[PDB]
């Protein structure tokens, strides 16, 4: 709009183009997201508007929702870097364990807050985890998935990443629960530790089979009800579960314990954000400041 002087093109999310913009008046620097079509559902705008009240230090603030000419703009507080970029920049030496722990602890606080307010993310990934020079990390796009929906790609021929998708979503479950976010975060925690994606599937089935190959093909024993799920097939190969010690070496037993609880197959057995915060892994948590090159 004419109220913003597009500084640059921050990128192209799974909803639309994102710009770093400066408020001509306030001078405020923000992230402006133009949402993808021909009318804008009033149900969507109401849902979105509710999110302006969902404020927490570990949640990227949604400053404004602007509906105009079949176009919807979301104005968000701006942060200089995402975790995907930071991990790549830290690929040679790895992110120090104290910082990994701090980030996981903060992300869990953010999740606990949203979940206590009955708001789910549903599409957590390194790119929507934003960080600043203060050692803070925040979750971006909370609640957008429900307020809207999800197509085959993003909106314009852009492959949607499935690497962080919970198995219940992959097996066709129609009702998501807060557990899907814990799964995604577990996958991200593993990636920060090993410096490699945990389950980098390139198709829905490859995603599911990569999970099965590591955690074992689920059955009625570990996941009651799994064989009755929409896309479950009796023909799925039966893989034995691997040792966590081989999954995220050289993570210590406190870390491996927490991760295994975040990756339980049964959404109901999967640990909650609130409960994870009390896990012994965080007994010595601190808040280190990252070396950020902007
Ligand atoms: N709220 C935000 O600040 C932000 C928003 C989205 N987004 O998709 O809504 C993506 C990245 C973001 N910042 C990190 C960033 C900043 C500058 C860059 O050049 C690249 C990444």
Can you tag this structure with a few keywords?
monomer, 294 residues, alpha+beta, Phosphorylase Kinase, domain 1, Transferase(Phosphotransferase), domain 1, three-stranded antiparallel β-sheet, binds 2-[(4-hydroxybenzyl)amino]-5-nitrobenzamide
Give the strand tally. Answer: 8
Structural class label: alpha+beta
**SSE topology string:** EEEHEEEHHEEHHHHHHH
State the helicity in percent bands.
25-40%
Tally of distinct domains:
2
Separate helix tally: 10
Unique bound compounds? 2-[(4-hydroxybenzyl)amino]-5-nitrobenzamide
Based on Cα principal axes, name the global outline.
Answer: globular
Level-1 CATH class name of the largest domain? Mainly Alpha
Largest sheet: 5 strands, antiparallel
Instruction: Please report which band the strand proportion falls in: under 5%, 5-15%, 15-25%, 25-35%, 35-45% or over 45%.
Output: 5-15%
Q: Compute the CA-based radius of gyration.
A: 19 Å
* CATH topology heading of the largest domain: Transferase(Phosphotransferase), domain 1
Order the strands across the largest sheet as they lie in space.
1-2-3-5-4
* Straight-line distance between termini: 27 Å
Question: Under the CATH scheme, which architecture of the largest domain would be assigned?
Answer: Orthogonal Bundle
CATH superfamily of the largest domain: Transferase(Phosphotransferase) domain 1
PDB class: transferase/transferase inhibitor
Keywords: protein kinase, inhibitor, TRANSFERASE-TRANSFERASE INHIBITOR complex
Assembly: monomeric
Entry title: CDK2 in complex with inhibitor KVR-1-91
